[PDB]
Ligand binder design. Structure first.
Ligand SMILES: *SC[C@H](NC(=O)CC[C@@H](N)C(=O)O)C(=O)NCC(=O)O
Ligand SMILES: *SC[C@H](NC(=O)CC[C@@H](N)C(=O)O)C(=O)NCC(=O)O
Lengths: 94, 13, 13, 93
């Protein structure tokens, strides 16, 4: 286990725009060893990558192609972390 | 359609 | 990393 | 089940090549109503699409980036059809 020791936060968990990279961070320092899985589900395909953060958290960026409501899940050892899944409204680009 | 994408990495202390 | 892509369509007769 | 009345078959359930569209067909005619889910899981990102085939089956094409073993899932109403997941060895071109 250890999912309860993981926290995720950032703009990409609150709102996104179609085609614009949406970014958030995952606090992993306390969780120990395990599989950290990020998933995006919704009306269009998503591309997800892991990134560096200065603060030592694990950075995530994703891009979706169409507006709509998407669900972003973050699981650790196949267990939802607190507040996952996140419902993220994705708007047409401004 | 309904689309899902996932990526999974290993964390090691 | 391990990657997963999925696509779900609704089948309707 | 209902997923037990679904069948899938084609080169893309047997073997594939990185960068090369891998194709198979799903016979859906007698599962009735429900959600047909195809998933590809493995060492790189998969692009997946559907085509309505002229023979009346549901066509599927996928492309993956890297060689390795991939699991191709075909589920009907969250249940694996017979022989799913398909383990597909993927060669480099
Ligand atoms: S987002 C990739 C992820 N990174 C982290 O959890 C950041 C860990 C941090 N202390 C650092 O500066 O590296 C990851 O895959 N981590 C690799 C690992 O072995 O934990
Ligand atoms: S591959 C998309 C899928 N098509 C089929 O299952 C083949 C349908 C076939 N009888 C035809 O030639 O139309 C699909 O999403 N079909 C729509 C549906 O509700 O059946």
């Amino acid at each position: 286990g250890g999912a309860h020791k993981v926290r995720a936060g950032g703009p990409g968990l609150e709102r996104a725009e179609a085609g614009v990279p949406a970014e958030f961070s995952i606090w992993t320092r306390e969780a120990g060893a395990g599989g950290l899985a990020i998933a995006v589900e919704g009306p269009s395909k998503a591309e997800i990558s892991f990134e560096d953060r200065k603060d030592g958290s694990c950075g995530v960026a994703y891009v979706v192609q169409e507006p709509g409501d998407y669900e972003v899940s973050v699981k650790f050892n196949e267990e939802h972390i607190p507040d996952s899944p996140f419902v993220v409204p994705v708007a047409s680009p401004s | 359609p309904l689309y899902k994408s996932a990526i999974t990495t290993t964390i090691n202390p």
